[PDB]
């Protein structure tokens, strides 16, 4: 009330008696991911502040630093990190933010994972959100990091998104919104700055932004029903950021561009749109938080606008922050920021950006860093006594139960005829596991072995077969006709499996295609052997059509293993655990899942899943 008011007028007092070189390094958020110094030879990873790295903050007076797993490998160091990023920022303290969305994108260290977004998605209750964005906000304000680019609030409801996908929680706008809602309010009672991502809406693209600049054409009718509802949602409760989609939406905005890369005309992308960023979020949506531009160093941007002249032209948009406006990695490289400050600078002064609207928006940046309790600093604690309290807190015990249940929540299981489901091994039964990388099936091993530890199943023996890049041969059905009970984790991006008339090609001898083919193979084999024989989708789910003569399907929504002690999703346990009969699922689809063999059909509809007892939907 008061506060809010007292707030926005103390804001605007301390711009005020800004210089304009302030003012714009306030709208400038760099990442130094790696860094090179004096007398090395190549960039390497940025652990630890250096005098060098310092010297920049303390001349371009950034207002942010965005980090990345690079930066934050361990508890300890990452608190290091923070409080020497703050102690080098001369007059107004940084944001500091990450990508801590959970599930396949997170970045730290020695932090809780969490299944993900679609895995949330498929265990539907929006309290989950709430506790999921509360412990990562709870970790990341032990670790002196106070911004979170989350949540994802796109729709996944095109399932080739390369670039979404299971960072989505679901296809449907309602259940989007209610979980993203809740994921920024649990982050924001942590007071973490949260910023909903990625607008006006990254869900129905088939086109990666990091590699090219994508289309979305659909009219403003669909745009308003579907992409920009969890936004809206989101806004009316008091989001703090919105962060740009690089994708371009003729319906808001048809204003082309001559690329500098091919010299022809190309659609203007959502980040540097007046009309989606001013006429839309900022006017006729009503957001007044801060807009910060999604990563300007992607292919969607850099290929087609020059470096200084996207953030130019982000800015006059109408974004209050520029992330990543030029990759520095060497004080050789520094001239870099002071040509991005100078080009702004010249807008300026021509007036193409009046400063009112500079000082509009570092005053929305200045409001947030006090309202989040960045500004003033808040921790009086010595960096050892910061250090000691993050290593009680980050990874902690309670965090791995909470992320334990939500995972075994999560899992969907498709289908579980005449009880394949749970396994009951004898003693001395074989296991097959069987995934594409390594590490799952490092992960799925190291599951069961501690099952057999704590007494849960009987002792059994375990091999392994990885089989990305592979083709299933002779050797590999051997080993299916000697095991006693399979299990195979299926992994797909993009679902493309080549059928014709309904039949998909199971005479495809082209490497290339593995993800498609060589699980269906191994399925194949095991019911011609009679085998029990369980299906786990490991990435997007759409794969389970893959799988139609399959009698047990799960899905998990996570792909990552286990590799040098640690569990890197716990996604993939939960999903032994379920197989094994340990964990209850309940998950629901939060996706349709189309067929692949009656093309326009859908085989498993959004809210499908079944009680791995009885078999009946839940
Ligand atoms: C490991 C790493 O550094 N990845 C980043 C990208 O992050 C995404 C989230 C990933 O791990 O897949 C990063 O992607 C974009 O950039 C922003 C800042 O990191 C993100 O907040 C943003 O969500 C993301 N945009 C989209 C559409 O996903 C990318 C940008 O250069 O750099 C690495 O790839």
């Known amino acids: 009330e008061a506060s809010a008011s007292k707030r926005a007028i103390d804001a605007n007092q301390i711009v ?44 371009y007076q950034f207002g942010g630093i965005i980090l990345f797993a690079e930066n934050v490998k361990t508890t300890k160091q990452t608190v290091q990190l923070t409080d020497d990023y703050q102690k080098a920022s001369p ?3 940084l944001m500091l933010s990450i990508d801590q969305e959970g599930g396949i994108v997170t970045r730290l260290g020695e932090g809780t994972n969490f299944p993900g977004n679609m895995a949330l998605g498929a265990a539907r209750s929006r309290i989950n959100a709430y506790q999921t964005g509360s412990i990562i906000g709870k970790e990341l304000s032990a670790l002196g990091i106070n911004t979170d680019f989350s949540p994802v609030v796109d729709i996944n409801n095109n399932p080739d998104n390369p670039v979404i996908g299971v960072r989505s929680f679901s296809s449907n706008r309602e259940l989007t919104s209610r979980l993203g809602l809740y994921t920024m309010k649990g982050l924001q009672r942590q007071d973490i700055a949260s910023a909903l991502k990625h607008f006006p809406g990254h869900g129905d693209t ?3 932004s990091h590699y090219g600049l994508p289309l979305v054409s659909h009219g403003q009718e669909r745009l308003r029903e579907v992409e920009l509802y969890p936004f809206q949602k989101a806004i009316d409760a008091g989001a703090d950021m919105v962060m740009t989609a690089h994708v371009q939406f003729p319906a808001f905005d048809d204003t082309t561009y001559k690329s500098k890369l091919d010299g022809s005309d190309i659609l203007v992308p959502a980040t540097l749109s007046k009309k989606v960023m001013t006429g839309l979020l900022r006017q006729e949506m009503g957001f007044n938080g801060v807009i910060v531009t999604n990563a300007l160093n992607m292919k969607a941007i850099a ?4 470096q200084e002249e996207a953030v130019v032209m982000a800015v006059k948009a109408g974004v209050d922050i520029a992330l990543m406006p030029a990759s520095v990695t060497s004080l ?48 009086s604690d010595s960096t050892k006594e910061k250090i000691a ?66 007494k849960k199943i009987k002792p059994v023996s375990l091999s392994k077969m990885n089989f990305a890049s592979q083709v299933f041969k002779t050797e590999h059905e ?39 083919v060589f699980p269906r193979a191994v399925m194949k084999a095991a019911l011609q052997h009679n085998k029990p024989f369980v299906l786990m989708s490991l990435r997007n789910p759409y794969d389970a059509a893959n799988f139609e003569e399959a009698k047990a399907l799960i899905a998990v929504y996570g792909f990552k293993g286990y590799a040098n002690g640690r569990y890197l999703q716990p996604n993939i346990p939960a999903g032994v655990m379920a197989i094994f009969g340990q964990a209850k699922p309940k998950g629901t689809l939060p996706v349709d899942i189309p067929s692949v063999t009656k093309p326009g059909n ?8 079944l009680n791995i007892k009885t078999g009946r939907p839940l």
């Open 389 to 454: 309290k993050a290593k009680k807190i980050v990874g902690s015990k309670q965090h791995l139960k909470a992320e334990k249940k939500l995972a075994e929540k999560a899992v969907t299981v498709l289908k579980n005829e005449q009880h394949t489901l749970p396994f009951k091994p004898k003693k001395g039964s074989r296991i097959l596991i069987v995934a594409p990388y390594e590490e799952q099936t490092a992960s799925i091993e190291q599951t069961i072995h501690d099952l057999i530890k704590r």
């Open 91 to 93: 007059k107004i303290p």
């Open 332 to 379: 050789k490289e520094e001239q870099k920021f002071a040509r991005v400050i100078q080009a702004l600078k010249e807008a300026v002064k021509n007036g193409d950006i009046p400063e009112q609207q500079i000082n509009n928006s570092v005053e929305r940046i200045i409001s947030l860093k006090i309202k989040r309790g960045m500004y003033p600093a808040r921790n």
């Open 478 to 516: 051997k080993q299916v006709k000697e095991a006693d009970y399979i299990i195979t984790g299926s992994y797909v991006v993009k679902n493309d499996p080549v059928v014709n008339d309904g039949v998909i090609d199971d005479t495809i001898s082209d490497s290339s295609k593995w993800a498609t």
């Open 16 to 59: 005020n008696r800004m210089s304009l070189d302030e003012k714009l390094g306030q709208m400038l958020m760099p990442d130094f991911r790696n860094w090179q110094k004096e007398g090395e030879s190549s960039p390497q990873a940025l652990t630890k502040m250096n005098d060098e790295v310092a010297s920049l903050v303390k001349k």
């Open 303 to 306: 290929d087609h606008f020059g």
């Open 602 to 609: 859908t085989l498993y509809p959004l809210g499908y899943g």
């Open 206 to 208: 088939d086109v990666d």
